[PDB]
């Protein structure tokens, strides 16, 4: 036990808590994942927290259309949501609960799941408001400009989607589905597809960089059912991709193809075994 991390949450609980981080450079993802099992001998089920964080790369790029009649038209792809799904089939093993539980809009989002012994859980969508919990995990994460939404929810799986909603422009704010949105008429000669869109000073993290999430989802597991179960953790994003054309009468003109690539996603297969409290990663989609 002592090349465990264990805590002693109180009288007959603890909390083993285990890693695994898996990246693909394929899909510009990393999951960071930390599965805590909570043993309580008062509780009549098994529950491993699964808090998942890491880095989905925004995969944003600007190019040139290749073609004729393209030659004044240039590309770039950017991401409109990012998605971060946990699911499983096996009938031994449930979600009971999701964290963020409902859609929040703020720029900074930190909720806070705790536990006190005899199996009670309960959220908030704050961190700090309380100092009642046996044990505690907190999600936080920054998303300006972009919401969080739970997309679906089910006893089998969950599925959260940060979305982009609306920018700070140098005409005023404008809505994620702006056709115009980081169009402008290119100035300069050196990297011309580049010029056609609005500098990195007014991108926004999410859209220039990625996303870092920090999500919870608990899995339930009947003490006495099969010592294991599987699961998927997926990352990813939908990209957009705007085009503007420069023409040479009337200016630049821009279109928009919304959903243009969706479900670039990197899952992650698991394996949590319950009675040796250990997890594996048994497959993914790296190639
Ligand atoms: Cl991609």
Redesign the pocket.
Known sequence: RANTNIENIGDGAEVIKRTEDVSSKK??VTQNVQFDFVKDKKYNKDALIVKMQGFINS?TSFSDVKGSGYELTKRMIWPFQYNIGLTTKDPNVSLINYLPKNKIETTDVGQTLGYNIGGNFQSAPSIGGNGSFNYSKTISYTQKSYVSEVDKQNSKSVKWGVKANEFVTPDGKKSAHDRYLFVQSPNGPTGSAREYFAPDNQLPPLVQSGFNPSFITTLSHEKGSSDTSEFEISYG?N?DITYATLFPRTGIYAERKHNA?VN?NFVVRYEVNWKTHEIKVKGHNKH
Do not use: A, N
């Open positions: 899909w510009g995969r994003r990209l690539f670039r």
